[PDB]
From Swiss-Prot, chain A:
Disulfide bond entries: none
Protein name in the entry: Nuclear receptor coactivator 1
Subunit structure: Interacts with PPARA; the interaction is direct. Interacts with PPARG; the interaction is direct. Interacts with ESRRG; the interaction is direct. Interacts with STAT5A (via FDL motif). Interacts with STAT5B (via FDL motif). Interacts with STAT6 (via LXXLL motif). Interacts (via LXXLL 1, 2 and 3 motifs) with RORC (via AF-2 motif). Interacts with ASXL1. Interacts with the methyltransferase CARM1. Interacts with COPS5. Interacts with the histone acetyltransferase CREBBP. Interacts with DDX5. Interacts with the histone acetyltransferase EP300. Interacts with ESR1. Interacts with GCCR.
Domain notes: The C-terminal (1107-1441) part mediates the histone acetyltransferase (HAT) activity.
Curated annotation (Swiss-Prot), chain B:
Lineage: Eukaryota, Metazoa, Chordata, Craniata, Vertebrata
Coverage span on the entire protein: 235 to 505 of 505
Organism: Homo sapiens (Human)
Region (Interaction with FAM120B): 1-46
Tissue specificity statement from the Swiss-Prot or TrEMBL entry: Highest expression in adipose tissue. Lower in skeletal muscle, spleen, heart and liver. Also detectable in placenta, lung and ovary.
Keywords: Activator, Biological rhythms, Cytoplasm, Diabetes mellitus, Disease variant, DNA-binding, Glycoprotein, Isopeptide bond, Metal-binding, Nucleus, Obesity, Phosphoprotein, Receptor, Transcription, Transcription regulation, Ubl conjugation, Zinc, Zinc-finger
The protein, known as: Peroxisome proliferator-activated receptor gamma
């Protein structure tokens, strides 16, 4: 869960 | 010492000016007409909204406004995430705690920064090229009519502290680094960073507003007001999810709002 927040954080 | 705290305040300010397109500096310029810039298109009713669509970015108006508010929030969440990543020691935290801090912080910050764009009469939109009136946002049919008014009420109080961008840059960082958010795995390194940010904020408020006094103390009382507006906002969003059919919540906002207050 929190895929987008994970994506935004690792980008 | 005082030096390391000045350095943190300046790093945060630089990172803030980068991360967020429209600063409080610009927004007040626009709201007082104390720039040379082209004044923003005023949206004060149904007709002006229709004629407005030329200046902004994409069935009934209350639903169309709400979906526009949605897209701006998502962009806000992205800007805040970039700003968070600039807070020294933030990226070195447990990634699950990074997600948790953003998940609970982002709306407290949206509402903090929205105040920079508001007066008692209305709010700048689409990077200051629109001005949607408070009356117009109230006029909307319920539950959408109650959506923005609490943000306006918080904003008139908060804008009285006359904080500038350099102060807000640290205050925002302090909100992000809240060690009491539900489900945090490792509170200690968060409280360590927040302690440095709060000292930096206290010094910043002494230097930048020395004719003022305990601007610092009053400003910390408002971090609790921000949790209330968020709680109250989550409830109205809970109502809207149920009572409306032809509206869906943008996926990033579903991530954030799912299992929250």
């Amino acid at each position: 869960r929190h895929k987008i927040l994970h994506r935004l954080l690792q980008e | 010492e005082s030096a390391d705290l000045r350095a943190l305040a300046k790093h945060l300010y630089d990172s803030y000016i980068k991360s967020f397109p429209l600063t409080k500096a610009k927004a007040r310029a626009i709201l007082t007409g104390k720039t040379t810039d082209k004044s923003p298109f005023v949206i004060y009713d149904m007709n002006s909204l229709m004629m407005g669509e030329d200046k902004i970015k994409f069935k009934e108006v209350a639903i169309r406004i709400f979906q526009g508010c949605q897209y701006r929030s998502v962009e806000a969440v992205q800007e805040i995430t970039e700003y968070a990543k600039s807070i020294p020691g933030f990226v070195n935290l447990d990634l699950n705690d990074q997600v948790t801090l953003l998940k609970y912080g982002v709306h407290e910050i949206i509402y903090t920064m929205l105040a920079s764009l508001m007066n008692k009469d209305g709010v700048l939109i689409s990077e200051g090229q629109g001005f949607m009136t408070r009356e117009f946002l109230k006029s909307l049919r319920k539950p959408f009519g109650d959506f923005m008014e609490p943000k306006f009420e918080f904003a008139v109080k908060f804008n009285a502290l006359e904080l500038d961008d350099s102060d807000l840059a640290i205050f925002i960082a302090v909100i992000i680094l809240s060690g009491d958010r539900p489900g945090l795995l490792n509170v200690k390194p968060i409280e360590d960073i927040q302690d440095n940010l709060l000292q930096a904020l206290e010094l910043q408020l002494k230097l930048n507003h020395p004719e003022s006094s305990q601007l610092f103390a009053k400003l910390l009382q408002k971090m609790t007001d921000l949790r209330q507006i968020v709680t109250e906002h989550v409830q109205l969003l809970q109502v809207i999810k149920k009572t409306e059919t032809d509206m869906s919540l943008h996926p990033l906002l579903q991530e954030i709002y799912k299992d929250l207050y």
